Target: Endothiapepsin
Amino acid sequence: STGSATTTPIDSLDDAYITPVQIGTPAQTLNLDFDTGSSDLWVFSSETTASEVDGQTIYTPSKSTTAKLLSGATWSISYGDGSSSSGDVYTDTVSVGGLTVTGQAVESAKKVSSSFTEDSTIDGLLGLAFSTLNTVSPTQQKTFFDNAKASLDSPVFTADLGYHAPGTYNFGFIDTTAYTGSITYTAVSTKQGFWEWTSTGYAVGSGTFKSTSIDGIADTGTTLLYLPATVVSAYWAQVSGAKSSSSVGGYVFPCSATLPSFTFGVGSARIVIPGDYIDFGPISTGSSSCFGGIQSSAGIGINIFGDVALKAAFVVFNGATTPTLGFASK
Ligand SMILES: Cc1cccc([C@H]2C[C@@H](O)[C@@H](O)[C@@H]2N)c1
Model:
């Protein structure tokens, strides 16, 4: 089997991407944030504290003939940006772009943090990291991909995120028309439950490539590119007027600037992030100070190849017995 679904930026900055997902019988379609940095599929629901729902579409398990309460199961998750959610668990039929999994764990939110409430466009998350990170207790549950894998034509999914435009998540096949040149594959460590890999280095604009190992995760659920302070300093030094602002919470730059590209290494291959991908607009409405899309990972504990990097590439998440990651230009 295969699946193919369009993923769409939630706003003009590509802050996140939503993908429609069919849950239950008859189908209830929710727009979920596909997140290769986590492993829970959770949704706003009829069980979510009423005051914490503000415009989201909710899953109502009582209206699904295939929904079953997973007795005694609870979940609770906190993300890297400080947001969180928790609740109980159902199993139900879940379909993405024509690909169907029966008995998928659908984690129903009873509580969500303010940042989820305030984002009316995201109805929940669909985790695509390794199932070892799944927070369901006392019986850990499998991701949608993990459940689908055996049935897929090939045990892979691909992320093809657009810049200010729709893109595609495919399951079970590689669309050879969706990228240019070749796909370069690179080793993955699953020890932390992430799609963790090692970039071979970087370049700023037309500058010389610096060969240096940068360990990080491929994370579709993170907006920006988070890299070591040395690398980030080298980038923003090429932008006149750019500076790190503790009050704003990262590097900012004059909105009148022209940003240089940023290149990262995948083996001997190179992925080029165009300068305008790194522009996240005024820090507040009407400001002439703009927020940078490349930021220091120093306070995180890990480097993150988030959407700013991934949307510059066609990315293969290869879930073979020994997982690997593939990157192509597009
Ligand atoms: C501080 C700031 C200013 C302008 C824009 C942002 C973006 C960057 C990324 O973290 C996303 O979640 C934010 N909406 C952040």
